[PDB]
mmCIF file of C-alpha atoms and ligand atoms in Angstrom:
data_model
loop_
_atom_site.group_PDB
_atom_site.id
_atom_site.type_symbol
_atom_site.label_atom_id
_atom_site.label_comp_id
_atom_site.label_asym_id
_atom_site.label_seq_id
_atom_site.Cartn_x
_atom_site.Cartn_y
_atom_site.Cartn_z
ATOM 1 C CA UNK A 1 38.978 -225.497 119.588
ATOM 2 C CA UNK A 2 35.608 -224.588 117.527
ATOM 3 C CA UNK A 3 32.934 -223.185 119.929
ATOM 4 C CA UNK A 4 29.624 -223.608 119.168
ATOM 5 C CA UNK A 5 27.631 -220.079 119.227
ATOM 6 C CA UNK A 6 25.982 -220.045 122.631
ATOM 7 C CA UNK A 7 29.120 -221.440 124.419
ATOM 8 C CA UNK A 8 31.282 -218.857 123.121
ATOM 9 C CA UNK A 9 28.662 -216.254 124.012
ATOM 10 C CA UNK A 10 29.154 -217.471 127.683
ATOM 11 C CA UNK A 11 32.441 -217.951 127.684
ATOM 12 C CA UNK A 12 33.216 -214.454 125.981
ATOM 13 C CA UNK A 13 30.388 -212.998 128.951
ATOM 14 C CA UNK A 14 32.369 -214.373 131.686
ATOM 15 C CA UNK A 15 35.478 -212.962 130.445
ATOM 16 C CA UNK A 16 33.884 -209.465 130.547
ATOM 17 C CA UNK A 17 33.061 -208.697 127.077
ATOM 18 C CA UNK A 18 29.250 -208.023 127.404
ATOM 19 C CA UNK A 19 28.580 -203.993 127.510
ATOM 20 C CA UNK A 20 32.427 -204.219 127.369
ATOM 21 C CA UNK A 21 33.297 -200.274 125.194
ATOM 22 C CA UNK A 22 29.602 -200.428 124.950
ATOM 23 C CA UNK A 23 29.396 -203.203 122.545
ATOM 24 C CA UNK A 24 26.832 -206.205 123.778
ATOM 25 C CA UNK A 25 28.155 -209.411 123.750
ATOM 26 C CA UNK A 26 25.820 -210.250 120.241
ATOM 27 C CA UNK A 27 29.013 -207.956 118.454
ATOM 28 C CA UNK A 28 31.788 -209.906 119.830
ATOM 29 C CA UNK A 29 29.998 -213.338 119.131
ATOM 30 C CA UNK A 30 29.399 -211.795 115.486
ATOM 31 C CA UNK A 31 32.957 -210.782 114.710
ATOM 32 C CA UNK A 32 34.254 -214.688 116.078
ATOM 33 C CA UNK A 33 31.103 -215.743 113.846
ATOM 34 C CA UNK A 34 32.846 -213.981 110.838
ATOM 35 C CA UNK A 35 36.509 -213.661 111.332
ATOM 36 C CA UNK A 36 37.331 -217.185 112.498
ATOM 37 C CA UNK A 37 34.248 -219.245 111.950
ATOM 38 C CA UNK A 38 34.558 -219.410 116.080
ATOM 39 C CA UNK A 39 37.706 -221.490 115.527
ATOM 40 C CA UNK A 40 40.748 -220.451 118.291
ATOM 41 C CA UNK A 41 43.191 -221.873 116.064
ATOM 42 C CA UNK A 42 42.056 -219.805 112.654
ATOM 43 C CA UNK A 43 45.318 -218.379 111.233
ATOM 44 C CA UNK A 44 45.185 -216.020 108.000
ATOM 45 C CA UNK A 45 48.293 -214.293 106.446
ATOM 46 C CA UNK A 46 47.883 -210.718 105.129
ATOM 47 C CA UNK A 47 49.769 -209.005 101.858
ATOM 48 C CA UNK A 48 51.816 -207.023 103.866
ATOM 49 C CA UNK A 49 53.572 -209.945 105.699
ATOM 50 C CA UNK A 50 51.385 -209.530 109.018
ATOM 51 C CA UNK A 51 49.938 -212.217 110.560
ATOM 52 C CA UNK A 52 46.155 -212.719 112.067
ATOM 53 C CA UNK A 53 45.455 -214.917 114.580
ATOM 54 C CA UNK A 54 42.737 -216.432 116.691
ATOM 55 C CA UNK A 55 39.194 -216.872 117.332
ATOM 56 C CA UNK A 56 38.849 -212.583 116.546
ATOM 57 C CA UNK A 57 41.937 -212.696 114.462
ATOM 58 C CA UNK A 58 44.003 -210.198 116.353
ATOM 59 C CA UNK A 59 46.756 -208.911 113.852
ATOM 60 C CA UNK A 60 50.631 -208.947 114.106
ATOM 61 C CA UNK A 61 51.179 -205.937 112.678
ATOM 62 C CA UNK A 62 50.666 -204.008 116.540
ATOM 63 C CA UNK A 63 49.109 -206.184 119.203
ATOM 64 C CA UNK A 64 51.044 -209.793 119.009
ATOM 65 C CA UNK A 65 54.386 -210.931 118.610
ATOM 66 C CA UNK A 66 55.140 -213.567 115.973
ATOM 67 C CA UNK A 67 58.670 -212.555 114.782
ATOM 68 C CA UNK A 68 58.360 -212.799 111.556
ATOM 69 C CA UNK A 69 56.337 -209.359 111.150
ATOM 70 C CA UNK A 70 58.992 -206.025 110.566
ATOM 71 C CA UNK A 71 58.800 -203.221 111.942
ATOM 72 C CA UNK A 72 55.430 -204.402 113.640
ATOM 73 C CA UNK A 73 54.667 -203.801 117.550
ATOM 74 C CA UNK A 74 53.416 -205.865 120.219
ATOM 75 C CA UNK A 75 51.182 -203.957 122.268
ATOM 76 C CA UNK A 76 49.141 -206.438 124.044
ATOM 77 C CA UNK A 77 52.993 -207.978 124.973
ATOM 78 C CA UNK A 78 52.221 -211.774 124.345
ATOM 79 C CA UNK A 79 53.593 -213.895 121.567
ATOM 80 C CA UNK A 80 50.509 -214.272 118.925
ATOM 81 C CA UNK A 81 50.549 -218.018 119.818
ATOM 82 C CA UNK A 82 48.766 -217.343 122.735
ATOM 83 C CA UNK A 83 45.609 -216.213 120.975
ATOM 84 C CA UNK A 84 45.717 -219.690 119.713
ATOM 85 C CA UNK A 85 44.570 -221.367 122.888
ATOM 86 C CA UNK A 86 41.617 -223.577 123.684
ATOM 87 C CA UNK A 87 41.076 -220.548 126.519
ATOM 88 C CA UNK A 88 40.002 -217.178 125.202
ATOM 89 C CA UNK A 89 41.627 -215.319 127.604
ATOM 90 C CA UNK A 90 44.863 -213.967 126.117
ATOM 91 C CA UNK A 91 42.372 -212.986 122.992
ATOM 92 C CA UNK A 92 39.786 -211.666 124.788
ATOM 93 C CA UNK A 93 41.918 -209.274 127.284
ATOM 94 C CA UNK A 94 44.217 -208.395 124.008
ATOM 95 C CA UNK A 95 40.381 -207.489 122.380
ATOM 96 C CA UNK A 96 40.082 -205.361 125.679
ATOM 97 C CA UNK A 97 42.897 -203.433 124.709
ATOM 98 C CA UNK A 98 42.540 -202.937 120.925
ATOM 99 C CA UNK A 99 38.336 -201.759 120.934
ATOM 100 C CA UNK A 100 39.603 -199.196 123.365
ATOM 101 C CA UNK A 101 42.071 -197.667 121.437
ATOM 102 C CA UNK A 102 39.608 -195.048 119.607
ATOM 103 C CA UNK A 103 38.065 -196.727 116.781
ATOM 104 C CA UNK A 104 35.831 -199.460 118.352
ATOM 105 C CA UNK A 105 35.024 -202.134 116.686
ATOM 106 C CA UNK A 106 35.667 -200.907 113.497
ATOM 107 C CA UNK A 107 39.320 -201.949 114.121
ATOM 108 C CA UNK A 108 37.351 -205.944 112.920
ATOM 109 C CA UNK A 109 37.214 -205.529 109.013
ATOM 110 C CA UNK A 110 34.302 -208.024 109.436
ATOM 111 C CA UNK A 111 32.272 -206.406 112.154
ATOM 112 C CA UNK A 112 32.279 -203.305 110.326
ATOM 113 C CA UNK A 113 31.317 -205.338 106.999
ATOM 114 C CA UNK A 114 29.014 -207.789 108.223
ATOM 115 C CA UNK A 115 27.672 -207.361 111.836
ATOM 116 C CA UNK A 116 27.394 -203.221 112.343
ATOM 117 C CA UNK A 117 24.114 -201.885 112.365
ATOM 118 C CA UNK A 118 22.429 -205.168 111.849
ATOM 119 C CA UNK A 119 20.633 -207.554 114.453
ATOM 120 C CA UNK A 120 23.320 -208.738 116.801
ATOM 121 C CA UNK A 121 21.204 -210.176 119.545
ATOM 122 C CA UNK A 122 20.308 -212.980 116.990
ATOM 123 C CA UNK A 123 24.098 -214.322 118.046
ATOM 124 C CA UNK A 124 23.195 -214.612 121.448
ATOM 125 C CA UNK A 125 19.333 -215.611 121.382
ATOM 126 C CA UNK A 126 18.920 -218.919 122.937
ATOM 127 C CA UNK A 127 21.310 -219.218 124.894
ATOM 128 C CA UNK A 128 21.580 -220.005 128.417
ATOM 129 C CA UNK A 129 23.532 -216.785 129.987
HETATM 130 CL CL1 CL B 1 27.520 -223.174 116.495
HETATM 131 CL CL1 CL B 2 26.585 -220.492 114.196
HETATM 132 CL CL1 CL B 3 23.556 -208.409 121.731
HETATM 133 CL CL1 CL B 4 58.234 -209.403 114.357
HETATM 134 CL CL1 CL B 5 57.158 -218.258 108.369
HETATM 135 CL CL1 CL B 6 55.436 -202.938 121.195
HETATM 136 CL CL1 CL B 7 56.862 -213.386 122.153
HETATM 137 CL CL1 CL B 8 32.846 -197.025 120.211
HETATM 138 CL CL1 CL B 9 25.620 -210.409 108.410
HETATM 139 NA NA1 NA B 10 54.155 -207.840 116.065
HETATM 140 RE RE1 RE B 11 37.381 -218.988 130.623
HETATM 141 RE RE1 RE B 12 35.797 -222.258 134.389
HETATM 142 RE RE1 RE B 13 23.887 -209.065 128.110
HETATM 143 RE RE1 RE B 14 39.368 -211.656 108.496
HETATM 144 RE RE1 RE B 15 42.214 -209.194 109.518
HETATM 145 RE RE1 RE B 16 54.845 -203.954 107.751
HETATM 146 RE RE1 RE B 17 15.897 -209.369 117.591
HETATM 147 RE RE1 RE B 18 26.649 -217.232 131.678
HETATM 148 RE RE1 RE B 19 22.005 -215.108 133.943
HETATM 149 RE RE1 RE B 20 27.702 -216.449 133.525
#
């Protein structure tokens, strides 16, 4: 599925994301804006092997299993198929889990690149909440 902006910005709301770690729901929309073009069933491979997956593009390498990834873990325990979905809420709970493991946000290539420390609210302006 491709969201369109404001619907994701609801959707990713009423799964808990707004203020969720701190970060207002104008950082998640930005990092689906940037990693995935707000497409669930963006897939990108990485040089070492890994896998990323998903509307945020949650990586194989430690949070999903896609068995094709060595030595990698699976710490949100689902296979990375399930970030896939029409319904964000394997990749949003597995988001949970990751922006609370110390680094924030940070742990998004393209939120640190591309949507830290610049107007987030834009993402969200508009939009019926
Ligand atoms: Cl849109
Ligand atoms: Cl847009
Ligand atoms: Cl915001
Ligand atoms: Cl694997
Ligand atoms: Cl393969
Ligand atoms: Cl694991
Ligand atoms: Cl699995
Ligand atoms: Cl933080
Ligand atoms: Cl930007
Ligand atoms: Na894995
Ligand atoms: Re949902
Ligand atoms: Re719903
Ligand atoms: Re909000
Ligand atoms: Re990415
Ligand atoms: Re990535
Ligand atoms: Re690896
Ligand atoms: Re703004
Ligand atoms: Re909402
Ligand atoms: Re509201
Ligand atoms: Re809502």
């Amino acid at each position: 599925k491709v969201f369109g902006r404001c619907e994701l910005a609801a959707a990713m709301k009423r799964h808990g994301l707004d203020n969720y770690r701190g970060y207002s729901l104008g950082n998640w929309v930005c990092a689906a804006k940037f990693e995935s073009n707000f497409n669930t069933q963006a897939t990108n491979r990485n040089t070492d092997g890994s896998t990323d997956y998903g509307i945020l593009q949650i990586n194989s390498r430690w949070w999903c299993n896609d068995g094709r990834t060595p030595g990698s873990r699976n710490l949100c325990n689902i296979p990375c198929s399930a970030l896939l979905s029409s319904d964000i809420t394997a990749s949003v709970n597995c988001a949970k889990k990751i922006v609370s493991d110390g680094n924030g946000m940070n742990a998004w290539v393209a939120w640190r690149n591309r949507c830290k420390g610049t107007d987030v609210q834009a993402w969200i302006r508009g939009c019926r909440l």
